[PDB]
Write a protein that binds this ligand. Structure first.
Ligand SMILES: [Fe+3]
Ligand SMILES: [Fe+3]
Ligand SMILES: [Fe+3]
Ligand SMILES: [Fe+3]
Lengths: 201, 201, 201, 201
């Protein structure tokens, strides 16, 4: 198949007590898996349309592709963006840390803007730290669902899933507590990797 | 300023008779300029938000940034994607042509799928030929407005502005004629360049 | 058929010089007509799905229905909301005028809020004065496309089409001039009728 | 205040075993309350905007109003649409039942179409049985979030909250089981009342 479900780089319960193993298992095995199948199906349907020379359902297929592929992209990044508490540095450093200070003033200011974007979403969405290739800078974006509210070419560096399934079982309606706990499991080494590959554009 | 308006790589009337100089001038000098100014203002407001620790309008600012920056990105690609007819090849060749044949079966099939995506939009939008870095392939996407219906990391190769301001003065409601004419002014050299640089590899 | 294209209550050129006959004809005969067909088709497809017990394309059909039916609703209201310059009162009076003063302070304040909503849309949309049955009041809403950014149960009293096809041929990018000219052709007697039937909820 | 939180017509645990009291309490006391407060704040800000003639955040305020008011409207209908099993009929009858048979063929067909719309949503949303005043019929709509994918004038008769917070704690990702259970607690008397009052006639 064109798309495959990547395995978590850690145990389902490795992110506790910040994110429960219950959520991690349901989130990965159920949710992420669905996006993989949906993205594969969307492409299969588009190829079928081309062969039959009938693009009557093009609007449906393009949304199915964007929604599912974006869901696949976002979650793939999400898993690697995290790691067990004491496994990685608690703060960005080197070029990444410098870039954060340059475009946000400081690490704390970056977190403040990112958190505000994360808890204020009206509906399902994501908070994301991205590399803007045009302006050559790091910005924060607030995705709607998986595929809305973002410029083409945006390269994800750090993403936080704000869909209710990502936190409801543990934090219920208190989104602030979820975001607060999540910072404790962010793998800044992975974010640095994504920044290095993004900046080399 | 963070963002700046790029100059057109040709005269306003250089795309005639396929795209009028009347449209090109309004589209570039007025529309694109507004996106650049809006994107800069969004960043200024976000910086101000970080300074005072007041992210009350974070939802507004994130959409303002996504909408304007996406408009700036989309139009910047749009201008270079075109050139006066004759000054550029009529069909894709080499690696680009081979990739189009691989992911769409043929140039005509890609053209048909892209056209369908362009004319079927329910609202303002774009038809876009992008490089999918996760699936390592070329796909077509149907953007809504400027910043909706697309996965993060999507790299634009060829885009067509389907907002009514891009064709109404000349083609009125007949969007189908607009798309047909547009193919004649596509600069496949520019598309090939973008494809070669997609996900630095 | 379930839906039909209503005729304009006046000549195509009756709204000049505020809105050209060229626009009125294209807008009514081309655009509005498309929504009627699309809404009829959406329902036909849904009935076909029910008979076959296959709702695989339910997401597509529900969007097709909402988009097209909303387009039909919005335009139907739009036409009747207007009349040749000196044919109707230039200001709301009686219960309608009183209600406007009550929920906006004055007629001018209502226009200011309505205009701001009309010219600020990021993409296609509408500015609409509606009757909120729950709060029992008149509010202004900014529709996105035709079917987005509005609560269920909202009863349209006065609507302004801000899609580019509604003004580009005459006012180009200058949206402010279009809205300004449009106020001169608003049929307040029709708005009063819609208010009377809405308030009787 | 303009908007107020309505009390539930039954105890939080009255919908068990179909819908948990745990969900009902959080959903009502926390979620619905937030929409009421948000809708009131939106109106306050709009009034403030009119006072100072500063509509700079008009796009934000119009979305805040649409999102919150739609959430308030949707949930107000949602609560009354349900009642403990047994306390209300298991199937629609009289005029309502006849209308459902007319516009869907049968109660089972309406149920199947509604279910499909409920489980297939790409993001947060609602499945809604509404009265179409233009077509003079009963249709099903698939709302996105609270305020998207619906025509103006749509009158809610029966709605199902498909936001993850409405079922995750009990049904996890199995939205299909949530919908099946939900049918058991539908108060057809309330739906019949809403149908009788749809477009005062
Ligand atoms: Fe998720
Ligand atoms: Fe444009
Ligand atoms: Fe229109
Ligand atoms: Fe809810």
């Amino acid at each position: 198949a064109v798309y495959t479900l990547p395995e978590l780089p850690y145990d389902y319960s490795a992110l506790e007590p910040y994110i429960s193993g219950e959520i991690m298992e349901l989130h990965h095995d159920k949710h992420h898996k669905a996006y993989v199948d949906g993205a594969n199906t969307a492409l299969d349907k588009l190829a079928e349309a081309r062969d039959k020379a009938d693009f009557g359902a093009i609007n449906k297929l393009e949304k199915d592709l964007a929604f599912n592929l974006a869901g696949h992209v976002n979650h793939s990044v999400f898993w690697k963006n995290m790691a067990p508490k004491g496994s990685a540095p608690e703060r960005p450093t080197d070029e990444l840390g410098a870039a954060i200070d340059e475009f946000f003033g400081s690490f704390d200011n970056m977190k403040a803007q990112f958190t505000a974007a994360a808890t204020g979403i009206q509906g399902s969405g994501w908070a994301s730290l991205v590399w803007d290739p045009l302006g050559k800078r790091i910005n924060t974006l607030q995705f709607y669902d998986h595929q809305n509210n973002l410029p083409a070419g945006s390269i994800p560096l750090l993403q936080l899933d704000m869909w209710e399934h990502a936190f409801y079982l543990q934090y219920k309606n208190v989104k602030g507590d979820y975001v607060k706990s999540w910072w404790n499991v962010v793998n800044w080494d992975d974010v640095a990797l994504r920044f290095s590959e993004a900046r080399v554009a």
